[PDB]
Every structure is written in structure tokens, then in C-alpha cells.
């Protein structure tokens, strides 16, 4: 009833990477290594790098899923709030209920799990562009952490899994996410609080 969040590099040495975007007031997406936490604005591009030591087989896929970080909420499906699920902002592929979208990939598939009811979005693994050392996926988060009747100020984690063609686990990584109006300020504040 709860997806594992255990970091697992697996046989291919799978792990995530994030850009270094800084904490200026104007920043739209920024990652804190000290907090393992991504801060982003609503519906803005979040670049996430996929790193491997060796190339996985054809048919390998990468899935993203959100869960609540606090144990007492972890069995609750993370979904868009009653306002955002009804705002008709679909890209024609993502169901309006899904928090996490993949941007600019027509091969993205959205799953409503028939047993757990959890949402996820999965894309085929593709080779890096010539000249690049990793592949990047662009995610969007479609509700604020503060949305009432949705996340309602509760922190979430995104779990990224590398899967074979049957959906079996090959690798796993994860990060906390806060979707907020001013990611730069919030990252600075939370990093100061930690210190
Ligand atoms: C070590 N270097 C060479 C890795 C380059 N790379 C190939 C794939 C790759 C290429 C084709 C395919 F079918 C599956 C993975 C991939 N990758 C990993 C996650 C998502 C893409 N990275
Ligand atoms: Zn919302």
C-alpha cells in the first residue's frame, strides 16, 4: 500500500542529477542537495538528469510517482486538488487528476494503477543526444504544495524508477518536492533553517 523509496543504483548504476540554478528571487526551479529537495513554481519546467554507468536494454523505461513524505499520510494517493483537477489545462495526454506531467514527450504514458489507484507517468529510455553524457526528462508539477483539498501543505517525495519492459525494478532514486510561488526564497530559508 506504499511504494518503496529505497535508493537503488542497480546493475546499471542509475541515479538522478540536477542543474545548479541558484536561489535568485526570479528562479523557477532549483534543487537543494543539502535537503535533497526540489523547489519549483507551478507548471514550470523541472529538468531532471538520468545518469547510468552502463546502457540499459532496449525497452527500459523511467517512471515518476509522488507519495506523501510523512508516514501518517503515505497511504493517501497524491493527486491534484479539487480546483486544479477541474481547470481544463490538460496537454491532451495527462489526465487532469495527475500531479506530475512529462513535458514534450509524445511517448509519455500515464497510469492509474488498477489496484493502488496511484498515478504515475512513464517514458521510454532514450540515448543522450550526441555530445551529451546523460539524458534529461522535463517534469511539471501541476498543483502547489499548499493547495487545499489536495497536498494541503503536506510535503511530498517524487520517486523515479528505472524499469524493464515488464515493469520490474532496475533502479530507484527520489527527492522531496515543494511547489511554491518563490522557490529561490524558500530554498534559501529552508537551507538556513537546516544550518
Ligand atoms: C553510460 N552512457 C553511455 C549512458 C548513455 N545512455 C544510454 C541510454 C539508453 C539508450 C537506449 C535505450 F534503449 C535505453 C537507455 C541511457 N539512459 C539511461 C536512462 C535513460 C536513458 N543513457
Ligand atoms: Zn491545486
UniProtKB/Swiss-Prot annotation:
Phenotypic consequence of residue 66 to G: In sporadic cancers; somatic mutation
Organism: Homo sapiens (Human)
Phenotype for residue 86 to G: In sporadic cancers; somatic mutation
Effect of residue 37 to Q: In sporadic cancers; somatic mutation
Region (Interaction with AXIN1): 21-195
Effect of residue 107 to H: In sporadic cancers; somatic mutation
Effect of residue 96 to R: In sporadic cancers; somatic mutation
Effect upon mutating residue 141 to F: In a sporadic cancer; somatic mutation
Impact after mutating residue 114 to I: In sporadic cancers; somatic mutation
Effect seen on changing residue 124 to C: In a sporadic cancer; somatic mutation; requires 2 nucleotide substitutions
Outcome following mutation: residue 150 to E: In a sporadic cancer; somatic mutation
Entry protein name: Cellular tumor antigen p53
Effect of residue 16 to P: In sporadic cancers; somatic mutation
Impact reported for residue 61 to P: In sporadic cancers; somatic mutation
Effect upon mutating residue 107 to C: In sporadic cancers; somatic mutation
Substitution effect: residue 35 to R: In sporadic cancers; somatic mutation
Variant or mutagenesis effect after changing residue 100 to L: In a sporadic cancer; somatic mutation
Taxon lineage: Eukaryota, Metazoa, Chordata, Craniata, Vertebrata
Outcome when changing residue 69 to N: In sporadic cancers; somatic mutation
Result of altering residue 178 to S: In a familial cancer not matching LFS; germline mutation and in sporadic cancers; somatic mutation
Consequence of changing residue 53 to V: In sporadic cancers; somatic mutation
Impact when changing residue 177 to E: In sporadic cancers; somatic mutation
Amino acid at each position: 500500500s506504499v511504494p518503496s523509496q529505497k535508493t537503488y543504483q542497480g546493475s546499471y548504476g542509475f541515479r538522478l542529477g540536477f542543474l545548479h540554478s541558484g536561489t535568485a528571487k526570479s528562479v523557477t526551479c532549483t534543487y537543494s542537495p543539502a535537503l535533497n529537495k526540489l523547489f519549483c513554481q507551478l507548471a514550470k519546467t523541472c529538468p531532471v538528469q538520468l545518469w547510468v554507468d552502463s546502457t540499459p536494454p532496449p525497452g527500459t523505461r523511467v517512471r515518476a510517482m509522488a507519495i506523501y513524505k510523512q508516514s501518517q499520510h503515505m497511504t493517501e494517493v497524491v493527486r491534484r486538488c479539487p480546483h486544479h483537477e477541474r481547470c481544463s489545462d490538460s496537454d491532451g495526454l495527462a489526465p487532469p487528476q495527475h500531479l506530475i506531467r512529462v513535458e514534450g514527450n509524445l511517448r509519455a504514458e500515464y497510469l492509474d494503477d488498477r489496484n493502488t489507484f496511484r498515478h504515475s507517468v512513464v517514458v521510454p529510455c532514450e540515448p543522450p543526444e550526441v555530445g551529451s553524457d546523460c539524458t534529461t526528462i522535463h517534469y511539471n508539477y501541476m498543483c502547489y504544495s499548499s493547495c487545499m483539498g489536495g497536498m494541503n501543505r503536506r510535503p511530498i517525495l517524487t520517486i523515479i524508477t528505472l524499469e524493464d519492459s515488464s515493469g520490474n525494478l532496475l533502479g530507484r532514486d527520489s527527492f522531496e518536492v515543494r511547489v511554491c510561488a518563490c522557490p529561490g526564497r524558500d530554498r534559501r530559508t529552508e537551507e538556513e533553517n537546516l544550518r
